[PDB]
Amino acid sequence: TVPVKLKPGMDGPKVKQWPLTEEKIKALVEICTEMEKEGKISKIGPENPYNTPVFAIKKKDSTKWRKLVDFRELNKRTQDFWPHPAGLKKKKSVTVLDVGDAYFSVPLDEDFRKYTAFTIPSINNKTPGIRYQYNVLPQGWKGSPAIFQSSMTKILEPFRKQNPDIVIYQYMDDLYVGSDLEIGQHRTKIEELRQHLLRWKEPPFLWMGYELHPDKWTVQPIVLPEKDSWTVNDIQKLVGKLNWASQIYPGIKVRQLCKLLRGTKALTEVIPLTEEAELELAENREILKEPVHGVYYDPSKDLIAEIQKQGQGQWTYQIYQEPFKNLKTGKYARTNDVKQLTEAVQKITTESIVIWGKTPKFKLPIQKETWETWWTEYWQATWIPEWEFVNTPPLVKLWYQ
Amino acid sequence: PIETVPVKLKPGMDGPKVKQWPLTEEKIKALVEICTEMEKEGKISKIGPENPYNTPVFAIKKKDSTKWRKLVDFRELNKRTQDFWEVQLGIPHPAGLKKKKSVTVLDVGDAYFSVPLDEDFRKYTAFTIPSINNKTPGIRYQYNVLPQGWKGSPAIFQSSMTKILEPFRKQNPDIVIYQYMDDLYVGSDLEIGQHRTKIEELRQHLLRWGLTTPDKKHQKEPPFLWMGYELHPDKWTVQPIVLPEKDSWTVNDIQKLVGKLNWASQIYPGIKVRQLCKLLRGTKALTEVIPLTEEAELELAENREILKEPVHGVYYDPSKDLIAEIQKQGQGQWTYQIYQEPFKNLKTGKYARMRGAHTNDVKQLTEAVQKITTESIVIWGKTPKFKLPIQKETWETWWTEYWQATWIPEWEFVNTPPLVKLWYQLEKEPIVGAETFYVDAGYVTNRGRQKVVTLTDTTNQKTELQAIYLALQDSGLEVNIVTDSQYALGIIQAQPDQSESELVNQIIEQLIKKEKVYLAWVP
Ligand SMILES: Cc1ccnc2c1NC(=O)c1cccnc1N2C1CC1
Ligand SMILES: [Mg+2]
C-alpha cells in the first residue's frame, strides 16, 4: 500500500447523506453486503466521525445497480499526485469503458481508510444506519487512478504497441478508446480490448456502449433572425441582441439600425430597411459566423458550464473560464425537465473530459431540492461534476436560440 | 464482553490537568464510599502517582436522603477528546411506523456502567479524592468503563447496544426494536402472552451483559409519550393540547400558542394561525398585552373546537400506496393530507412557505409537492401518488414557459375548488391596433399621449414598475408595453399572481383585466 495523505492541515470529509428511497437502499445493502464478504469494505465503529454520501444508480443495458459514492469532498481534500491526448478529440470515434473494478484488487493505505467512511441510511431513522469504510481503492476516489496508473501502464502496454492507431485515455473509473477505424472494425478492436482487459467481471460500455464522434462536436454561433418584413419589434429585439454580442465582437454596429427606430412608432408597424442598414446587418451576420478570436484554454483556470432551458425539450450551454470568453457552446434536445437536464450535464461533462481532461463546474437552473431528489434516477456516469443552482435571466436565454 | 472502541485525544492535545477543588469532610467521606464500591465492581481502579492527569469531581445530593451522588466534570476531557460518529440525530415520525399488536418500552439501567473503555484512554479519565487527613495524599483512580458525562459515551453505548441486539434480532425477525438513548421500544404481532414472553427473553439477553431492565409490573404502558407524541401500538396523535382561556394575551402567550398550534397541524387538519400571528406585528415586548381582534378570536375559537375532539393518525401499511392530497387554503396557504386508505390519514400538514418576493399558485403548488415528496421519502422511503387541484393542461402550460426546470411525479387532477390556474398570460407577439406605451416616472404613447409624475420615498427599481403600472391604467383592453427595465420584465415575465409590495399586486390586477398584454424590453 502507498502512504496517501490529505492535503496538509486538512481533516477528513463529514458530508451529510441525502435521504434515499427504500429501493436504492435495498440495492446498496445487497451490494455492500457482498463487498464486505469479499473484504472490499468493513463495518466501522463510532470512533469514525467521517462521512461521504452514497447513491445507487442504474446500469444501462444491464439489470444491475451500481453503487455511486460521491467522493467529491474527499477528492478536494486528498493530496495532489506527482498527460492529456490533444489527439483524442481529433479522433473520429471514441468508446467509453467502465474499468472501475480494476481497483478492487489493490489495498488502501491503512491510515487513509478511515477517510472513506460512508453510511447506508434507514427509512425514517428506524435504525442507526450501516457504516463502512474502504479496504481497497474505492471507485470514484481521485487517488485510485493515480495509485493504479503504473499497474495500468504495465497492462495497456501490448495493446498500445499492438494498435498504436487507437489512442487510449483513462479518467478516474473511465477509459476513453479513440480511433478512426470503421464502426465494425472499431467495435471489434474494442472487444479485443475487453478481452485483453479481462485477461487481468468484464469492463462494460458506458454511454450505450456507443461511440461519441468527437469530430462533430460543433460550436454554435450566435444567430440573427432572417425575416421577410421587419416590424419595429423585430428590429428592437435585433438591436438589443446585437448590443449584447457587441460586448464580444466589437465590430458589431447598430447605429444604422437604431435609425429605423427613431421616434415612438407602433411595435407592429413594418419598417423597410434602408440600404445603409441592410448592409450593416449583413456585416454583423458575417462577424458572428465564427467564434471570437483569441480565446484559449487556460489549464490553470476552472471550466464553467452554464445551461439554459429553451422549452419544448431544448437546452443551450456554454463552457468558458472568463465571462463571454466561451471555449464552447452547444445545444441539447429530447422524458421530463430533470431527466433532460441530467442527460445534458453528463453529455457536457463527457465532452469537457474528452476535450480538456477535466470536469467543468455546472450552474444548474433548478431548485436544489428538486435536483437532489431526482438526479440519481437518470444519472449513469461514474463521476460527479461540481455544481451550483441558479436563476437565469430572460435576456441571456433570449440571446441564444 | 463487548468489543473495545479505540479512542484518542484530538491532534497535538494532551490529557486534562484540572486540580480537584476543596471538598467538605462530609463529601470526602460519601465519595470514598461511592468510589470504593465502584472499585469493587471493576468500574474504576486505583492508580499510581505517575498519572499527571486529573478531572475534578464533586458531590450532588439527589433529593432523597443524605446519601450523595458522584458527579465528574469532563468539560476539559471532552474538549480534548476526538469527535465521534454523531449519535442518532434523526428520529422516526409516528406516521412511518407499522402498527403492532403489542409494544413494550424498556429502560436500561447502568448503561455506561457496563461498557469497557479503551485501555489506552483510561489514563485521561483520572480524578482524585482529597484525603481528609491533612498530611495525607488523596486517592486517585481512572475509569475502566464508559463514564457518565464523557463525550464518547452516548455513541459508544449505542454502538454496543446495537451489537448486543444483533443476535436477538436475527433469531426474532418478527420483532421490531427501536433504540432511543436509554429506552428500548419492542413491538410484535405476537399474541399477548407470547409477546410478554419474548420481552422476558430480551430482558435476559440484556441482563447477560449486566444490563438491567424493568419487569412487567414496573413497565410503562401505552400510550407512550415520546418527543411530543402520544403513541399506541395501533394509532398515534400529538399529546393533549390545551388552549388557554383568558382575555389578556402577551406577545409571549401568542407565540407559545402559535407554536403549539403549529405542532398540532401535523394531525389536526384545519388549524389556522394567520390572525393570531398578525397580533405580533410591531410588538415592543414579550410582556406587551395585545387585544384579540374580532378575527383572531374567531380563529382561536375554531382551533379550540378542532382540538376539542381528538383525531388519531393511522400507521403505515407498506402493502398499500401512499396518497397525497393538496388544497389551497387561502392566498399563500396550502394544506395536505397523506393517506393510504381513502380518508384514513397517516399524517396531514400545511405549507405557507413563499420562495421569492413574487410568485404564483402554480409555483407554490409545485413547491408544496416537492416539500411533501422529500418528506415522504424520509418517512416512508417512497413518493406518494398526488391528487392535485390543477389541470394537466394548466400545469403543462406554465411548465414550458418557465425558464427553470422541474418535475412532478405521478399525479391526477382533482376537481375540488379552488382550482389553481393562471390569472393572465403575456402575448408572445406584439398586438396590432393595440396602442404602444414607451415607459421610462412616466411614459410616451405612439398615439401621442403621455404623462409624467414625481415620486417621493421611492427606490430606483420601484419607479420602474410604477411606469409600467401607469400605462396599464391609462391603456385599453389590449396594450403593448415597452421598457428598458430588465428587473420589472423578469418580475412580470414570471407572471406572478401574488407579491409582497402592493405596487406589483396593483399591476397584477391590471394584468388580470386585460384581454391582451405584451411586454418588451429595450436597452
Ligand atoms: C418511539 C418509537 C420509535 C420507533 N418505533 C416504535 C416506537 N414506539 C412505539 O410505541 C411504536 C408504536 C407502534 C408501532 N411501532 C412502534 N415502535 C416499534 C418498536 C416497535
Ligand atoms: Mg424606453
In order, the DSSP letters of B30-43 are: HHHHHHHHHHHTTS
Name the closest residue on chain A to residue B379, using Cα atoms: A124
Q: Is B457 annotated as a binding residue?
A: no
Residue owning the nearest CA to atom 7 of ligand 1: B185
Can you read off the three cell numbers belonging to residue A194?
A: 475487453
Which of B100, B125, B153 is the last residue before a domain boundary? B153
- Experimentally, the structure was elucidated by X-ray
> What span, in angstroms and rounded, lies between the C-alpha atoms of A381 and A360?
14
Nearest CA to ligand 1 atom 20: B187
B3 and B148 share one domain: yes
A81 Cα–ligand 1 center, Å: 51
At B70, phi and psi to the nearest 5?
A: -90, 130
Whether the CB-CB separation of B369 and B388 falls below 8 Å is answered with yes
Of B175, B202, B222, which residue sits at a domain end?
B222
Where do runs of H (alpha helix) occur along B315-441?
361-379, 392-401
Half-sphere exposure of B67 (CA within 13 A, CB side): 5
Nearest-CA distance from B405 to chain A in Å? Answer: 5
One domain, residues B8 and B136: yes
Q: Which of B371, B407, B484 to mutate to test the interface with A (most CBs of A within 10 A)?
A: B407
Q: What φ, ψ does residue A281 adopt, rounded to 5°? A: -75, -55
Annotated binding-site residues of A for Mg(2+) read: 98, 173-174
CA-based Rg of chain B, rounded to a whole angstrom? 33
| 3-class DSSP assignment, residue B339 | strand
Burial of residue A158, with CB atoms counted within 10 A of its CB: 0-12 exposed, 13-18 middle, 19 or more buried:
exposed
Domain tally for chain B? 5
- Probe residue for ligand 1, chosen from B231, B314, B346 as the CB with the greatest number of ligand atoms within 8 Å: B231
Chain A, nearest residue to B7 by Cα: A47
Tell me the ligand closest to B489's alpha carbon.
2
Residue nearest ligand 1's atom 13 by CA: B233
State whether B135 and B214 are in the same domain: no
Nearest to residue B311, comparing CAs of B273, B272, B264, B354?
B264
Q: Which of B322, B492, B491 is nearest to B411 (CA)?
A: B322
Q: How many CB atoms lie within 10 A of CB A230?
A: 19
3-state DSSP call for residue B85? coil
Q: What is the CATH number of the domain that holds B301?
A: 3.30.70.270
A54 forms bridges with which residues in the sheet?
Answer: A69
Sort strands A386-389 and A361-364 into parallel, antiparallel or unpaired.
Answer: parallel
**Exposure string (b/e) for B166-202, b if CB count within 10 Å is 16 or more?**
eebeeebeebbbbbeeeebbbbbebeeeebeebbeeb
The CA B333 to ligand 2 mean position distance, Å, reads 38
Alpha helices for A261-333 (secondary structure H): 275-288
C-alpha cell at A326: 466561451
Pocket test for ligand 1, best of B88, B99, B103, B229 (most atoms within 8 A of CB): B103
CA nearest A132 in B: which residue? B85
Q: Are B21 and B14 in contact (CB under 8 A)?
A: no
The CATH number covering residue B454 comes to 3.30.420.10
Chain B hits for A268, CB-CB cut-off 8 Å, are 430-432, 480
Q: Are residues B6 and B131 in the same domain?
A: yes
**Within 13 Å and on the Cβ side, how many CA atoms surround B195?**
18
Query: The C-alpha cell of B157 is what?
Result: 453505548
Q: If we measure between CA atoms, which residue out of A24, A26, A46, A31 comes closest to residue A131?
A: A46
Alpha carbons B31 and B59: distance in angstroms, whole number: 7
**B363, B366, B368, B371: CA torsion to nearest 10:** -120
Closest ligand, as measured to the CA of B202: 1
Contact predicate B306/B86, CB 8 Å: no
Residue indicated by cell numbers 419474548: B198
Q: Which CA distances in Å does B188 have to A246, B92, B173, B212?
A: 73, 17, 10, 21
Q: Are residues B404 and B345 part of one domain?
A: yes
Of the candidates B283, B335, B339, the one whose C-alpha atom is nearest the C-alpha of residue B312 is B339
Same domain for B288 and B434, yes or no, is no
CA gap A134, A143 in Å, rounded: 13
| Helices A275-288, A232-246: crossing angle, 10 deg rounding | 40
User: Buried b / exposed e across A3-21, counting CB within 10 Å, b at 16+?
Assistant: ebebeeeeebbebebbbbb
C-alpha grid cell, residue B405: 426546470
Q: Say whether A53 sits in a helix, a strand or coil.
A: coil
- Interface touch A367/B367, C-beta < 8 Å: yes
- Supply A385's cell numbers: 461534476
Give bridge partners of residue B359 from the DSSP assignment: B498
DSSP per residue, A235-268: HHHHHHHHHHHHTT-TT---TTHHHHT-S---TT
Query: Closest Cα partner for A252 from A324, A204, A182, A344?
Result: A324
Q: Residue B498 to residues A169, B222, B270, B330, B472: CA-CA distances in angstroms?
A: 54, 47, 23, 12, 17
Domains within chain A, CATH numbers bracketed: 1-81+104-144 (3.10.10.10), 82-103+145-221 (3.30.70.270), 222-296 (3.30.70.270), 297-401 (3.30.70.270)
Q: Give the C-alpha separation, A354 to A212, whole Å.
A: 10
Q: Smallest Cα–Cα separation from B76: which of B126, B17, B121? A: B17
Q: Is the CB of B185 under 6 A from ligand 1?
A: yes
Cell of A254: 447598430
Q: Which three cell numbers stand for residue B111?
A: 448503561
Q: Mark whether B371 and B506 lie in a shared domain.
A: no
Report residues near ion ligand 2: CB below 5 Å.
B 438, 440, 484
A23–B158 C-beta distance less than 8 A? no
In this structure, is the dihedral angle defined by the CA atoms of residues B139, B140, B146 and B147, taken in order, positive or negative? positive
Question: Of B423, B458, B476, which residue is a domain's last?
Answer: B423
> Residue A345: in which H helix or E strand, if any?
helix A337-356
Radius of gyration of chain A, Cα coordinates, nearest whole angstrom: 25
Q: Which of B100, B104, B237, B312 to mutate to test the pocket of ligand 1 (most atoms within 8 A of CB)?
A: B100
CA A153 to ligand 2 centroid distance, Å: 65
Which atom of ligand 1 is found nearest the CA of B223? 10
What resolution does the deposited structure have, in angstroms? 2.5
Do A128 and B84 make contact, defined as CB atoms within 8 angstroms?
A: no
Q: Which among B96, B378, B446 has CB closest to A19?
A: B378
Residues B311 and B430 in one domain: no
C-alpha cell at B153: 459515551
Same domain, B9 and B123: yes
Helix B486-493 with B502-513: angle, nearest 10 deg: 60
Confirm if B455 and B397 have CB atoms less than 8 A apart. no
Task: Round to whole Å and give the CA distance between B486 and B464.
Answer: 10
Q: What is the CATH number of the domain that holds B73?
A: 3.10.10.10
- In A49-92, the DSSP E strands lie at 54-58, 65-69
| Same domain for B166 and B273 | no
For residues A168 and A268, give the distance between their C-alpha atoms in angstroms, rounded to a whole number: 58
Same domain as B431, residue B513: yes
**Cβ–ligand 1 contact at B187 (below 6 Å):** yes
Same domain, B242 and B307: yes
Beta carbons of A365 and B403 less than 8 Å apart? yes
Q: What is the DSSP string of B241-308?
A: ------S-EEHHHHHHHHHHHHHHTTTSTT---HHHHHTTTT---TT-EEPPPHHHHHHHHHHHHHTT
Ligand nearest to the CA of B467: 2
Q: Between B153-171 and B192-208, two packed helices, what is the crossing angle to 10 degrees? A: 130
- CA–CA distance, A56 with A247 (Å, rounded to integer): 45
B176 lines ligand 1 (CB under 6 A): yes
H or E element that contains A311: strand A304-311
- Of the CA atoms within 13 Å of residue A93, those in its CB half-sphere come to 16
* Residue B107 marked ligand-binding: yes
CA of B28, closest CA in chain A: separation in Å? 35
Yes or no, beta carbons of A46 and B96 under 8 Å apart: no
Are the beta carbons of A267 and B367 separated by less than 8 Å?
Answer: no
Asked if residue B418 has a cis previous peptide bond (ω within 30° of 0), the answer is: yes
Contact state of A391 with B85 under an 8 Å Cβ cutoff: no
CA B318 to chain CA centroid, Å, is 24
> Is the distance from the beta carbon of residue B224 to the nearest atom of ligand 1 less than 6 Å?
yes
Q: How far apart are CA B357 and CA A382, in angstroms?
A: 39
**Furthest-apart CA pair in chain A: how many Å?**
80
Max Cα–Cα distance, chain B, nearest Å: 109
Amino acid identity at B192: I
What are the residues whose beta carbons fall under 8 Å from the beta carbon of B297, sequence distance 6 or more?
Answer: none
C-alpha cell at A29: 445493502
Binding residue ranges of A: 98, 173-174
Domain span at B325: 317-423
By CA distance, what is A264's nearest residue in B?
A: B446
* Ligand nearest, relative to CA of residue B484: 2
Q: What DSSP element (H or E) covers A147?
A: helix A143-153
Helix B502-513, helix B460-474: angle, nearest 10 = 30
Is residue B360 within 8 A of residue B422, CB to CB? The reply is: yes
Sign of the torsion angle spanned by Cα atoms B464, B467, B470, B476: negative
